[PDB]
Design a protein around this ligand. Structure first.
Ligand SMILES: *C(=O)[C@H](CC)[C@H]1NC(C(=O)O)=C2[C@H]1CCC[C@H]2OCCCC
Length: 359
């Protein structure tokens, strides 16, 4: 058993060098090991005001928000309000274009709909334009044949996953996910009384923050501190300890394997690789050329339930932040790395892989 001291050094001697080389002003880390999380804070949350990163510091999660969208979706499935097999059209009858027919809620949740673009275009400001956008979309591939990572796919899935509930996305997430897990410092919209905890992002010397856009709460809009995030990782890492029954199942469903893409497996928001896995295959699958490419898929039908020996992770960014989380259920270890600079993902996973490998 690694002492608290050794682990502190291990995190120290990995993150500082990582912050120097990538000139990251601030980052907070945890470190889930032996039932408890362990926090480490470095640098600044705001250079201009010289406020150091604290365990209360709020960070933009970026694409890591998709993991919440994934679990919230699984929760609706657990309650029976929705089914992955249903036609997307079943929750958006207005979507009449014949090209949507054999497309499922599953395809949306897993970027397998046939080439939905990485982003929902900027001309899309309201409901009428969201409709027109999707209504005009012409698929490059048949459903369930190609994985093309997109915010416009999963963004839609989350907004449609909550319709039967009659609850707006923000309200459904706080009620069914955030509140039952005691994540009271995680928000889709930071309340005025917490702005003070809100860190500033840092693009090339410039202080920045995410902007509002359609289907954002679902794909890249969530903010939290390292404590809430560590508990969000503890819940996803050990759902047995989750009392709420539907939420317990929603978590398992998000970690379930729906498609094999080379060495990777696609869940609801989460992505997985069998453990043991070498750092080289996780670091290289992390490169833009791989992560943005539309790759041929292999259906895991029926969906494989959570496999403990999995390296389960998710990377996320906004203009000014960079975050990464990874956990191995079989070994009850996990890591949260929140930084206020969007550095390269391959650099995030190597550092994460390095500290976990020590545990
Ligand atoms: C998840 O981290 C996102 C989703 C919004 C990643 N996808 C893209 C994109 O669709 O362009 C990103 C990237 C994170 C960084 C933000 C965004 O890049 C746009 C450029 C503005 C920084």
């Amino acid at each position: 058993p690694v002492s608290e001291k050794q682990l502190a050094e291990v995190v120290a001697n990995t993150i500082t060098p990582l912050m120097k080389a990538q000139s990251v002003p601030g980052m907070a880390v945890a470190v889930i090991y032996q039932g408890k999380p362990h926090y480490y804070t470095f640098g600044k949350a705001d250079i201009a005001a010289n406020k150091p990163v604290t365990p209360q510091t709020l960070f933009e999660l970026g694409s890591i928000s998709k993991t919440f969208t994934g679990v919230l979706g699984g929760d609706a499935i657990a309650r029976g309000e929705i089914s992955l097999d249903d036609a997307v059209t079943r929750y958006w009858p207005q979507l009449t274009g014949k090209q949507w027919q054999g497309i499922r809620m599953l395809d949306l949740a897993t970027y397998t709909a046939g080439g939905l673009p990485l982003q929902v275009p900027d001309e899309v400001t309201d409901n009428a334009s969201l409709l027109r956008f999707y209504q005009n979309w012409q698929p490059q591939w048949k459903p369930g044949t190609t994985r093309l990572y997109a915010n416009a796919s999963i963004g839609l899935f989350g907004a449609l996953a909550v319709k039967p509930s009659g609850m707006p996305y923000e309200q459904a997430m706080t009620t069914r996910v955030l509140k039952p897990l005691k994540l009271d410092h995680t928000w889709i919209n930071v309340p005025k009384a917490e702005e003070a905890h809100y860190a500033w992002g840092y693009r090339d010397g410039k202080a920045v923050r995410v902007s509002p856009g359609m289907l954002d709460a679902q794909a890249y809009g969530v903010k939290t501190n390292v404590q809430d995030m560590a508990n969000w990782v503890m819940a996803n890492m050990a759902p047995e300890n989750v009392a709420d029954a539907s939420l317990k199942q929603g978590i398992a469903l998000a970690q379930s394997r729906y498609w094999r893409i080379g060495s990777m497996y696609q869940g609801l928001g989460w992505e997985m690789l069998n453990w043991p896995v070498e750092a080289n295959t996780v670091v290289e699958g992390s490169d833009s050329k791989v992560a943005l490419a539309p790759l041929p898929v292999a259906e895991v039908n029926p969906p494989a339930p959570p496999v403990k020996a999995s390296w389960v992770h998710k990377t996320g960014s906004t203009g000014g932040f960079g975050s990464y989380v990874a956990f191995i259920p079989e070994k009850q270890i996990g890591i949260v790395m929140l930084a206020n600079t969007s550095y390269p993902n391959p650099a995030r996973v190597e550092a994460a892989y390095h500290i976990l490998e020590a545990l």
